[PDB]
């Protein structure tokens, strides 16, 4: 309650080890638990945090705030504050909290907090209102009718859209307990991924080419001669990255570090290179910290990266700053690449709109050779601006393409490189079909029985989402419509019931989650599950780093780990065909015997290409049976970097720092190759929103809001400073249209209708805009299309729209500030 | 015991006539190794003192990791040069964009119409670096 | 926040007065609201409330909890504790607070606290998501449609269900406001009440005799010589008129005042009576205070009131145990009453299965002179079992006939009055319509444009509420379909839209309330009202004790003060109706120049009755005018009883304690008038389930939750005690159902499907049960039927179903307790 002090940890307080629950970066924090009425004293050696607050603290000595403790509940009914902070001996962070992390302990998980409204028990929508239901219950429904669904229809009538990340909401437990129960136990080919509407992947090209996406550390980062930043807004996106690793570098503190490797390599001020159509807060404070000298922004027209990177490949083979010795043995396809990707600076620059003089010097800052010979190192880092941009596939052939010839892979300094999203932690079973299916489109066109949101929201996140609420909405009152007629039906009768209403169009839809969510319009089911800290968890960062974030805490009421969840259902399977007589279906479900989440880590990552193992696709690799709970708490929060070289008790997990510093890729002859890159300009379905509408709708990320905002909706600051997704607008255009901040318009296309509230933007290009993805209130995906490459990736980034003033949302203009997010 | 607040002291800052429109003037509350800063804004906001309720005083330590911020005239905000948070003086310390879980803190004064006195006597909020407001 | 101590009020803190936001008895209050960073000293000069906190204080002293502070943050962004504690001077209360009037700090609207949910801005459904919408915007699509509406369907197309009560989401500002609005400006007869899905009284019957059911005074029931509660659970549902009138009379602390008042009576130990088919805690709480000689619990069939007091009428007048000089100098119909309403004891005992001596000893009791001659003062309260009993209006005419003939009006320590629910407030004009309409029947019908519910949720309480339901989210969704396809319409282009829909079986909804509720699962509209304490508000108690509940904060966002919400509609359509040059429509809409709620009492209950007022049917009467804000104030939390007779600077309101007391009634001739009372059974459509199925499916309130747990469904205590909707069994007929506490149950009929946790209870007989009425998790009006009496009043306790077991929820067994509430 009050605002002027904080309980200080006692010095015996009990310290566990936690994972920032959020982004890619995987900062490492601490968690100190103690019973609610003791506390530790001011003096540095009676308190747990070893500080003395017996007078002012310096700069950088804490990160400490009430957003940052909490008092939980547990199972027991004793009272307990925590505490979570980042650890100062971390390597990924050294003592660093974004205010996305800072949050952890406000988002824990208490009877009355934000997180007040978790999910404790199954929910059901008995037809028309929302009710308990019990464990058992929920499971003879669902189970039920995924049974009935694999008896007559097959695998392809039960659908999921799931995690396959890493931390909060993933990691290897859950994701190998979800794949085993979606691929080996049912055996449905009918699956998509929580951001994109296939069983597919981002970097289909950079890792045919046989670069696998996270290829070095973070530390590479520190000793970067140019750092390329393409369609990403890392200051936001990836905060402690950027101020712990690249941000030294620009500043000159790592310039030892780099001379004291390289003894005879010229190592100029460090420089940054953005292709970004927008002037983001990552510009502006890479030019505040390195000045403008040293920042060059290529604010290149939206989608044409493919272009861009044509054009620079073709000009670093023409003036000779390619690696010749590198390409002749280590590469296949490059005359080819030169001959496919043929494009002059004059061509590129009309097509990115990036003056020439601009091109030239991005190249001579990253590609020339230095005064001592070798080649910069140059890491290219890129995120969704690409990912999600005008043909994922061609974009990445064209920067690997660049990045081959430069050999900007395997040196030091170096690396291209996903700055990632949400932290990683994938070990599944083989996807089971042979062709990637739309699911969206599928369950649009009426297809499948059963949808389960498993850990996602495609309600707010989907591209072309206004289409699938729609098709969900109606295809879930179908549903609630026939099980209004039951009175007094068995569980088994009401399972037949909703199958009978799924042939007419209907769709049984289950949502596990911490919250209701959005979904909660649409579903039927919703099952409780827990985050890590009320559960053990693994997950890896942006460089590969695993970690161990502990249990220190009891879930909300009956929530159960994600992977556990998945065992429960395969039981019920199971025991549901043994009941039936059908021993080969009952076998299927086999497997799943867990108690912990320990269990699902050794059945799945310690399992992977060890003998009599089946077939597991896993980013710990064969060497996985390494890794143990007990080594993990062991290595603390700097943990190991994947995958394991060795480990004994005297010297612990070793690792490996970066990838392919050999020279031997990830393909049939250990080459890399190169890919062919065609400039077609546009989509035409995104070029015919461009024809007709007025504005470029970019979309994407703000730093204070973490993804679609399950925590933050509940979150009074947060909610008083972002009260509705806001528009970013040129303020020419802002005077034309008659609005100002906190005024709110219909943003809208062919593809759908949705809301935002105006946020003059001076930095905004005419014609352009930027709207906060993913939103609690005005979603932004109404409007992105169908779009998709060929392995089915969405443009996300790629949609046009117009503007229309709805109001004065005056309330928004005495709450909300306008100011400038661009540090000056 | 007995006590729930803390028990701040009442330091006198200026007379309210003295302050001139966006200058900001520096003081130390509730103790010389906390630093604030008053300033009349020239238009009043919601909770603003003076005869034109526009005056407010923060603390101007960053409730990131405890920098000194700087008052930017141009756009009335505190500006941490520590990781980049940027506050909004005209929004109750609200963070416009950065690191901090915290807005911030105000410094709460009374504004006596008998003599002109502008008397810092609370904080709103937690102060970087400190256990409590009051030490 | 810590549990373990609160901050006191400073000597000087503010305070004003507050009657209680719930139930009829009004209890006064006081709020204590200091700045939060003061606090008062524990000596009792140095806090507010004069109370000594350096010792233990003795029991009586005080009523305060932490669940009775908090810290409210207001428009200005300052905070303040609030601290909102029982007036100990005040009459009606005396210090008593109960469970749910105690937490009325808790449920002040703060950012972080059990309101933090509250509605701040106008929400809109646009078509596939909720977003925030303008005031002005709101205003164009609701007024636009409404006018749309009347100018082509005219009024008949406009629907309302609103409250019509006092206290919080009622009052005489509010009501005024809301039926200006209806009835005068729109001028719409569609319109249903809170609780009754017609404009209707629950009264008819005793009103139509010359009897308003509000007669007395509280003190009338110290002054009793035997009190009749009929249909009614008064420790649980009007607390503390139990407990500071009635128990002080049972314990014999009235004896002397009786005494006093009366020289020459004959003052026996106070006895008590209840009719009702269940026994409540009521029933146990009176038989450990009086003893089980001093209760009488006739324990009738279900619906079978009529036939009880036609028996017991029969009987006083074959005894001779009347008042002849009574009947024949003030009353008409006696002898025909006789002849009509006869019915022997045996014939009552065999309807009623109450054994003959039993039907004896209540009129006994009752009726039968004392022996110093005078007839017992006996005072009949009844409520909600005989409201929403077998035929409304023939069960009052039975009462009283039998209350008229002996006298139990108008006499000190009598009444035939109402109990309540809410408190009162009404001031309206006259209803516009000359039949009465059954508004859920017309809206399930298909007809209808636009409805709004206004301060009430019919999801949760309509009666037959499953149909209502069905019915109203699919005509909902008809309309969502048709805004889905619009796209950068203007607001009078989706005024088109949404009007075509309804031409096509769709309803456009509006809700205009204080949180989202389940309203929100069909609503397209939402608005946000404030609750007393962010307004001024006025009403009236179960003895007509008129009070000021006085601002001292700020209401959430832009929420505002319903009476303001109703200036805002009509001014929207005046102005509408101004712009099209329609300038006769335009002035209906005058008169609501309003900028304080102040304005609406000045309009509405200070004009009823004055030279050149339009119609006012207002529960101040004539005399309204004497009463002002100011006024109320110097009276404080002990206000006046209506109506005033007269006022002066020097003597205050002086108002009016018992009606009826010369004999004069609200008749043509000042007579009070008999009425036929025909017993017919149980209605055919409540009969056939009762043919059809088990369990009597009895219902109504419990003690500490208030009404659909609007505020309590976020208070994580209440959740923890009755997390779901509870069911009290007959403990065998658990074990036949192998059920026991914390199991689920479906209950079913023909009119619907609902759920509940089973609650075993000694108490309630075999083939009996009781279901928490109107809650969040489990709705119970879902098996009601439609069966009305002949003024459209629900027979709501008139239902039979069958019960079957879902299942055990473990949680419920682990955390709810389902310990007897029958306390001994
Ligand atoms: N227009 C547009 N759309 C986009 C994007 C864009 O750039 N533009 N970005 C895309 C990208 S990169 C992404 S990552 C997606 C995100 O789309 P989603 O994955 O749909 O969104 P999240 O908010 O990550 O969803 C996490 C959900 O899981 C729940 N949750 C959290 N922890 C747990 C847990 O332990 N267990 C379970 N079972 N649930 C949990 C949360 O309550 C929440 O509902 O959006 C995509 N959509
Ligand atoms: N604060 C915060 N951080 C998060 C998240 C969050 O929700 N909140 N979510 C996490 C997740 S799951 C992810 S995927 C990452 C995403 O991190 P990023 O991809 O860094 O973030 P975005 O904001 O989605 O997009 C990056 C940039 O792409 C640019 N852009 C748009 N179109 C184009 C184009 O055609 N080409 C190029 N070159 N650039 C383009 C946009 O202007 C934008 O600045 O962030 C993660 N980190
Ligand atoms: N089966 C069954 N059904 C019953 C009954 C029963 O005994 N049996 N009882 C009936 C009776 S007596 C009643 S009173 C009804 C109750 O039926 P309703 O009136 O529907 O229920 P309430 O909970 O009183 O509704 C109050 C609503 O107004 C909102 N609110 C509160 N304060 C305000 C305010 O200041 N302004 C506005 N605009 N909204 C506000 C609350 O959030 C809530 O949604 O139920 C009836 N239904
Ligand atoms: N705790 C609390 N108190 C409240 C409220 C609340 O929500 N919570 N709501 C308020 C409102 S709006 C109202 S209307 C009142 C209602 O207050 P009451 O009417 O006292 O309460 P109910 O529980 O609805 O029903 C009263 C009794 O009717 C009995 N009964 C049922 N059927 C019959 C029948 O055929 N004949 C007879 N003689 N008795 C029968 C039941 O067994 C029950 O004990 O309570 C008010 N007070
Ligand atoms: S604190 Fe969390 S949100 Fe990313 S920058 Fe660090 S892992
Ligand atoms: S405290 Fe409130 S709920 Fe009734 S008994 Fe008194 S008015
Ligand atoms: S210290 Fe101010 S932003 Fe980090
Ligand atoms: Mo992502
Ligand atoms: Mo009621
Ligand atoms: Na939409
Ligand atoms: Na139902
Ligand atoms: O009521």
Chains 1, 3 share one sequence.
Not at chain 1, 180 to 205: D, G, W
Not at chain 1, 795 to 800: A, E, L, N, P, S
Request: hydrophobic share 35%.
């Amino acid at each position: 309650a009050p605002n002027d002090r904080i309980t200080l940890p006692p010095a015996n307080a009990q310290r566990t080890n936690m994972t920032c629950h959020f982004c890619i970066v995987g900062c490492g924090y601490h968690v100190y638990k103690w019973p609610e009425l003791q506390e530790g004293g001011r003096a540095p050696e009676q308190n747990a945090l070893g500080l003395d607050f017996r007078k002012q603290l310096p700069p950088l000595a804490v990160t400490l705030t009430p957003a940052m403790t909490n008092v939980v509940t547990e199972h027991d009914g004793r009272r307990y504050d925590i505490m979570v902070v980042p650890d100062k001996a971390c390597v990924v962070n050294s003592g660093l909290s974004s205010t996305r992390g800072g949050k952890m302990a406000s988002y824990m998980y208490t009877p009355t907090g934000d997180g007040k409204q978790r999910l404790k028990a199954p929910r059901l929508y008995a037809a028309d209102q929302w009710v308990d239901t019990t464990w058992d219950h929920a499971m003879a429904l669902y189970a039920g009718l995924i049974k009935k669904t694999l008896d007559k229809d097959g695998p392809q009538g039960v659908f999921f859209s799931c995690f396959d990340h890493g931390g909060a909401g993933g990691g290897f437990e859950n994701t190998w307990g979800t794949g085993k129960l979606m691929f080996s136990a049912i055996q449905t080919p009918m699956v998509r991924i929580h951001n994109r509407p296939a069983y597919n992947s981002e970097c289909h090209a950079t890792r045919e080419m046989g670069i696998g996406e996270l290829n070095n550390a973070y530390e590479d980062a520190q000793l970067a001669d140019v750092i390329w930043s393409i369609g990403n807004n890392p200051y936001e996106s990836q905060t402690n990255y950027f101020l712990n690793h690249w941000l030294p570098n620009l500043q000159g503190a790592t310039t030892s570090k780099k001379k004291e490797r390289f003894p005879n390599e010229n190592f100029p001020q460090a420089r940054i290179i953005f292709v970004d159509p927008r002037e983001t807060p990552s510009v502006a404070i890479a030019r505040h910290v390195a000045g403008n000298d040293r920042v060059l922004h290529l604010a290149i027209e939206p989608g044409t990266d493919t272009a861009l990177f044509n054009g620079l490949f073709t000009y670093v083979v023409e003036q000779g700053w390619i690696d010749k010795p590198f390409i002749e043995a280590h590469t296949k396809g490059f005359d080819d690449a030169v001959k496919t990707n043929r494009l002059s600076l004059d061509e590129c620059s009309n097509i990115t709109g990036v003056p020439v003089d601009m091109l030239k010097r991005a190249a001579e800052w990253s590609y020339k050779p230095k005064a001592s010979g070798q080649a910069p190192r140059t890491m290219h880092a890129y995120e969704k601006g690409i990912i999600w941009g005008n043909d994922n596939y061609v974009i990445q052939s064209a920067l690997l393409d660049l990045v081959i010839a430069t050999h900007n892979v395997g040196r030091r300094g170096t690396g291209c490189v996903r700055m990632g999203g949400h932290q990683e932690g994938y070990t599944r079973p083989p996807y089971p079909g042979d062709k990637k299916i739309y699911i969206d489109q599928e369950l649009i066109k009426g297809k499948g029985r059963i949808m389960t949101w498993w850990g996602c929201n495609n309600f707010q996140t989907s591209n072309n989402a206004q289409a699938l609420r729609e098709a969900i909405l109606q295809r879930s009152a179908i549903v609630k419509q026939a099980m209004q007629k039951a009175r007094g039906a068995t569980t088994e009768e009401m399972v037949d019931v909703i199958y009978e209403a799924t042939q007419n169009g209907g769709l049984f839809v289950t949502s596990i989650n911490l919250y209701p969510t959005k979904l909660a319009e649409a579903a039927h089911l919703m099952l409780p599950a827990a985050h890590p800290g009320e559960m053990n968890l693994t997950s890896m960062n942006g460089e590969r780093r695993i970690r161990l974030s502990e249990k220190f805490m009891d879930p909300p009421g009956t929530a159960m780990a994600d992977c556990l969840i998945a065992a429960r259902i395969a039981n019920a399977l199971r025991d549901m065909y043994q009941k039936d007589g059908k021993a080969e279906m009952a076998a299927q479900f086999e497997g799943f015997d867990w108690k912990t989440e320990e269990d699902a880590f050794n059945d799945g990552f310690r399992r992977a290409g060890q003998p009599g193992a089946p077939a597991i696709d896993s980013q710990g690799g064969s060497t996985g049976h390494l890794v143990t709970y007990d080594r993990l708490r062991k290595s603390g929060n700097n943990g190991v970097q994947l995958p394991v070289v060795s480990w004994d008790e005297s010297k612990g997990l070793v690792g490996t720092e970066m990838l392919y510093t050999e020279g031997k890729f990830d393909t049939d002859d250990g080459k890399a190759h190169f890919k062919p890159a065609p400039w077609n300009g546009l989509p035409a379905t995104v070029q015919q929103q461009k024809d007709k509408y007025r504005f470029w709708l970019n979309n994407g990320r703000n730093n204070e809001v973490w993804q679609t905002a399950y925590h933050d909706q509940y979150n009074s600051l947060m909610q008083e400073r972002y009260p509705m997704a806001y528009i970013e607008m040129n303020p020419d255009d802002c005077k034309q249209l008659d609005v100002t901040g906190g005024d709110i318009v219909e943003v809208y296309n062919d593809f759908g209708s949705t809301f935002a509230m105006v946020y003059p933007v001076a930095e905004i290009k005419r014609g352009q805009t930027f709207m906060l993805f993913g939103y609690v209130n005005g979603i932004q995906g109404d409007v992105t299309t169908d779009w998709t490459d060929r392995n089915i990736i969405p443009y996300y980034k790629g949609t046009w729209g117009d503007i229309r003033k709805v109001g004065s949302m005056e309330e928004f203009k005495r709450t909300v500030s306008f100011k400038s997010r661009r540090f000056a | 015991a007995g006590r729930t607040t803390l028990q701040y002291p009442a330091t006198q800052v200026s007379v309210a006539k003295n302050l001139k429109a966006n200058e900001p003037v520096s003081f130390t509350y509730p103790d010389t190794s906390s630093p604030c800063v008053a300033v009349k804004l020239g238009s009043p906001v919601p909770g603003g003192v003076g005869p034109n309720n526009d005056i407010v005083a923060y603390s101007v330590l960053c409730t990131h990791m405890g920098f000194p911020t700087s008052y930017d005239k141009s756009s009335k905000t505190f500006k941490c040069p520590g990781h980049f948070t940027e506050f909004d003086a005209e929004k109750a310390g609200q963070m416009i964009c950065g690191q901090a879980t915290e807005n911030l803190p105000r410094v709460l004064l009374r504004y006596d119409e008998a003599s002109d006195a502008l008397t810092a006597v609370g904080v709103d909020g937690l102060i970087y670096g400190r256990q409590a407001n009051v030490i």
